[PDB]
Amino acid sequence: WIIRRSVANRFLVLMGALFLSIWGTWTIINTPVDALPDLSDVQVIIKTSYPGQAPQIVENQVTYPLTTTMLSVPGAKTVRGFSQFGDSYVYVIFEDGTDPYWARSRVLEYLNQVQGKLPAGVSAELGPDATGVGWIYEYALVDRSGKHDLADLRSLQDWFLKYELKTIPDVAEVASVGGVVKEYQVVIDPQRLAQYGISLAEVKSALDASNQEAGGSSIELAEAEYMVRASGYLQTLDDFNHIVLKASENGVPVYLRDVAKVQIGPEMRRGIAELNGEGEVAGGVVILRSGKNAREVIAAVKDKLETLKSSLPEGVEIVTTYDRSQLIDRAIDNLSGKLLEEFIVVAVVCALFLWHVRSALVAIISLPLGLCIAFIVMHFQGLNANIMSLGGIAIAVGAMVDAAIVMIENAHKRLEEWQHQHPDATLDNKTRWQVITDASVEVGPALFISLLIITLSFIPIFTLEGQEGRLFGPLAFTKTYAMAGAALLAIVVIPILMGYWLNRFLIRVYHPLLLKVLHWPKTTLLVAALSVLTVLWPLNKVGGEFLPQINEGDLLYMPSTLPGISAAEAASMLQKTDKLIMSVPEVARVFGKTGKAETATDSAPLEMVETTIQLKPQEQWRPGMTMDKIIEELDNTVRLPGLANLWVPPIRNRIDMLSTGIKSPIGIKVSGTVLADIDAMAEQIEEVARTVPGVASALAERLEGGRYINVEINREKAARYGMTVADVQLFVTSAVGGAMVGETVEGIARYPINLRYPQSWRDSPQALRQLPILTPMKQQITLADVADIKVSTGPSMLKTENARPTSWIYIDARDRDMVSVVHDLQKAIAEKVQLKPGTSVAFSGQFELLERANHKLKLMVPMTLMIIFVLLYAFRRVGEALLIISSVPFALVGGIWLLWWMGFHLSVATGTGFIALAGVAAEFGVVMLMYLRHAIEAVPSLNNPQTFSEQKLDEALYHGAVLRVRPKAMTVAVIIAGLLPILWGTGAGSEVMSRIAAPMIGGMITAPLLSLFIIPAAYKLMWLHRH
Amino acid sequence: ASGVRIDPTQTQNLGVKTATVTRGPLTFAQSFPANVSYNEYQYAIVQARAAGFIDKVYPLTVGDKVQKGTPLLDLTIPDWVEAQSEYLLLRETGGTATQTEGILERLRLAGMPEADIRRLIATQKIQTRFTLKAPIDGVITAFDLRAGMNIAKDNVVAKIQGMDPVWVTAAIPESIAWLVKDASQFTLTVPARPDKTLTIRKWTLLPGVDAATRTLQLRLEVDNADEALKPGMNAWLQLNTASEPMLLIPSQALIDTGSEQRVITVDADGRFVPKRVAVFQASQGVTALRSGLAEGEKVVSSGLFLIDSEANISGALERMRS
Amino acid sequence: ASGVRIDPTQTQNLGVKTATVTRGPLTFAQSFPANVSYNEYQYAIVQARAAGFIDKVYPLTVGDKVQKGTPLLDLTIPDWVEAQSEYLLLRETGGTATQTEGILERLRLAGMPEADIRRLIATQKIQTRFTLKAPIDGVITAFDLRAGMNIAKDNVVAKIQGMDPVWVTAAIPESIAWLVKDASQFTLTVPARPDKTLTIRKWTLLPGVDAATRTLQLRLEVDNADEALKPGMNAWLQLNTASEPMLLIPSQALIDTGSEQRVITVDADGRFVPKRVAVFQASQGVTALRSGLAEGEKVVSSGLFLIDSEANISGALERMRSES
């Protein structure tokens, strides 16, 4: 119907399509790419920093009144709270669908009220607008000229770089990593305090009342307004020294100089950064706003650095340590390459079963405007996101051209009839118009119905909830697009571009075995069905990950150790590790990192290390080298005692923590209300994961491995010296601990100032016990005199997931598939570990994300069968519709057997594939069920629906065979060919392209090679029922 | 089963500022707090040689300035009449020359001033009313006798101390006792009078230090003909000088635990090497060393290689060697 | 089998260092503040022997240094004139020597200084004016007599305090009393004079504690002929003290989790094996075990954390506890 309206408006629409085409080629240009918009977002981070060093009340309380409030906030669900050495992390969570900022605006209702109950000096800080996945571009500042040092470089970062980059749009936070913060250290000699009769408290105060400015209003002179202003800012070491502590009637004072030494020095260090195992360095890291564009930002950054070449001081070098573009491009280049190779293959298939320059051209033109239409609808979803958008336009390039070529063939031989009946020496414009219409009438309807069905069989992917859904969501859309559009172009354009403008030795290879399928119809039907049983058996060879392990050039090394390591030690362990990693010939750069960075997005403790390894381009590796083989050398070369090392890709990591929390692919979590119970379950589990042959290393982080030095103040004792419990603590918070006490205001910079006894006095449980104390009544005592001090063990870091304690168990498998490992893991747990009181076990990582995808699939096949049935009844007949569904499973049978030969697994990439395999069935049913109907609708069909003569429909079906092969074989040729590229595993993201492909590869070869005999030989058995 | 080795010792090739052990002087530029005060070698405490009652007291009081000879008060002293009579009556009958010389020198020992005994011989009359005058120029800082009172021998009738050469005393911090002992010249200044600023070249440094503060006492005398510098005024004593040449390294370069002090030396190749050092004293950003380094050695200027709020100073240094 | 084997090329990369156990005494070291003070055995408080009146007062004040012999003031003492006169009288008229001496004695226990009685017999002249001089080298710290005054037989004319064998007294907190034994070694050091190397003559732990500051009193007599050590100066007293003999290991090599405390022994085979020790005390970088080891035994003192971890993970620690 609508195709006639098309030939009516011959010109116009075509020109519109080529306009929608160039509009398509721009609906893309907002391109770069997102390797991943795969992040969860129903979480707002709240980071309270250094209220006090007490991993039992500081983060019992910040996880107490502060989370009790996050129990009160609307949209409330679960209030988890990391709670560590003076740092408090809290992650609020929501319903999946919720709008990002909606969440924040609610979380923000009780961050304010609560702010007041925090001690002085701590601010409960809200996370950034971005997530962990947003870590785009990292870099270390270096200088080999020795003209600068860590102190200067870090300051170069905090007060120049960070401010220059944070400006660039779409960036959410330029965090600092590693480096040294300049600190003004007031080292108070406890002996001076006594000798000069000045108390610690007096010093703290004296220092406070001497570091600020004052306004004195204005004062009009000469009718002008003169602004009175007073100095007072500390900015010379001398100024420190000349802080007055007391003065005589003589006017002879005692300065801070007389009881202390003011020395510049490194502040405390939260995390350490190291480069190439040859030097500790200062770093920055650009975090990208939640939604915005990765590459666009990246590129805008690079140019902003070249604007800083005449800007940086002599000797300073930015050595870049991580770059998302390198992958993003390597991924968009490969997929572009394929869209070009699959285009040429069809131009050599539509030209191999059609010998006419203007015959291949037509089918060829079906692509540029079909590619562009894809680009259009690639704006409704934006192809800014993913290979899947491009991969989905590469996965269905085979069927997009199918729609045209098939029509073309129904025209070819439809011309071989009007030339044999009518003459040959007289043809006008009307005659060609009439054959084009005839060609469009018989193969017309059938073709469309099909392409509706395929998009319907695909619909059930929209319902896939989460990261997997986002992974094949664009693909689920970008396929329903160029296909539902090519069906629109082919019905309003294609025909007009074909009007305006050895196949023997394959028909002889076919039909000889065809006439044999009729020896007995039903018996040939069974011997083919038993080929389904042969697929069920070898279901038992391959496995199934959640997602094909996509490999970026960058590589994340995350070794974990027992919970107690010291900063100094871990920083060393880091440089040790960095030197080994660097020794492996394939690595180019190594950017280590213990602790965290100046970002709310980093909770990692010191005993954990993230080291980011870039390997020199593949064009420079050793002879027989491979990623999976490099990682193996790395795991053997890099290894120290008591240090499990886990190897994980840069991206997968942050995301993996944003979805479940785990850092590794394998993840066991043991959440318990008690503490001793969870750590107990954690160790037992840890031990069985080592025995399993499918493990490279296993270690469950601890919770209660913290080491403490207790100062139990004795009220009664202290009382004797007139000291309150607080009076003594000042020697803990400031004398022993070097608590901050102020900041020097240096222009656009701010550096900390602090009091402390010289190291020696606070060296050990012995030193602490002999801490000299100058009491209020000027008595000279020692800390022990007013408190016992014992060494003890306790919470290393309280952890919670949903307000209930828990410990993550990290496991690393890579030599053996996942599903085979995970199943054994929870089968070794229940059979050996035994069930302890109240302590629930469960899994995580990728497995947890795999279980969410599997579910709904039993509603993804019937929701396709409930909608496929509706589509099967373009033929109206029910008994005919049932056949289709049974001719499809055999096509599935092919997708499996090829997984085996390729050595692939059962992912949701393959899962998607198989559904797009049945998406071909409907079309397949249309190509032959229309031919079969026709043969028994044609002039020999006044021979069958009248009487009986078996040798009559045997010629109508033999003719339906020679008619299908030509248009059908060519349609298969394009698929097999577009099947190969996706099958290849060379390139960035080609593996994942393969897993989502092979399901269709074998799947398509088995349908033609099967449903060419089975579809017909089942109709020669249903006609023989009505009669 | 790998056998690839690696160097464990901490390493740094990406940012290490190094200074070179030079040899030179510690310089100083300080201003000590000082006070203007009475000269203590100009001290007069007047008190009667005998008991008596006060007749009159001249218009003085504490705080007033007096010149030598200024009458203070008149008093009647009877302790001397008995013996004075003796001398007189002795002349009425022409006693021996020595008989007189005797009684007359008994009066001296008696306490009776010499200038009052002459008034005994000249007038030949008994002397009962005497006048006490200020013995020296100066300021009256005590005055315990008024009209109507009796006068005991221990009462002070006047504490007269002078300012002729007025005194100034600076309070120098013990810390630089090693330097001020061999000092050469200070510059005195007093905010009360911005033109009386002169260069002090002679001064005595007292052998005791105030303990309340811990400061040395440097006492110098300034001429005060005009009476400009008034005792009780604030003054400043400044000291600009350099020390005897010693080993000098940047103060930043010294890693001092509470008990052990040392520096990170950079060797002939590029390896770090912690060496113990002996300190003398620092000043204006540089510390002199008593011993430990060789003039010209390389040394890094950082404790910035040992995260403050952790690491064991001892332990962190060890990781840098072997 | 206890302990745990570790790939020798991993511990080599770790940079594992090891120290050797040994028996000996632990030397405690602790610092204390001290004041430089005057010497109280160099103490003279000049007081006139008789009453008179000040004739002249020399250029001196409190704070000035004086030597033995320095004139302080002149005074006229009448009290002795009679006796003297009576003595000179009998000298004229030849009285027995038993009579003469029997007068110079009345002169002596009257008060008149021996030297002025000598000046008498030497000149045969009545002595009326006298000069009090400084009986020792020292520092005037009191001076209540100025020109124009009468002198009472109880006014302090000069309080002179000496300081050559100067005193330095450190203050130890009562709780730490035990740190100071007889064997204890001491080292003085004054900040005011970084260039002086002090020599302690003798040191004493004083009978009682200064109830004011709850500190014991340790007084040292210290050479000071250059007079560089001024009274009032700050002085830091560093003390060393040896304990009874004990097993000795580096402190960097002992793990203390409160409940237990252990060290990692390096076996003969290079097999790291944990062992429980009982600590006794620790000071200046070394801790003394009361028991648990045997001299000669090797003890890891670097990379200890990780190695202990590995040992904990390998169950090496869980083993150690059940075996004994």
Ligand SMILES: [Cu+2]
């Ligand atoms: Cu991590």
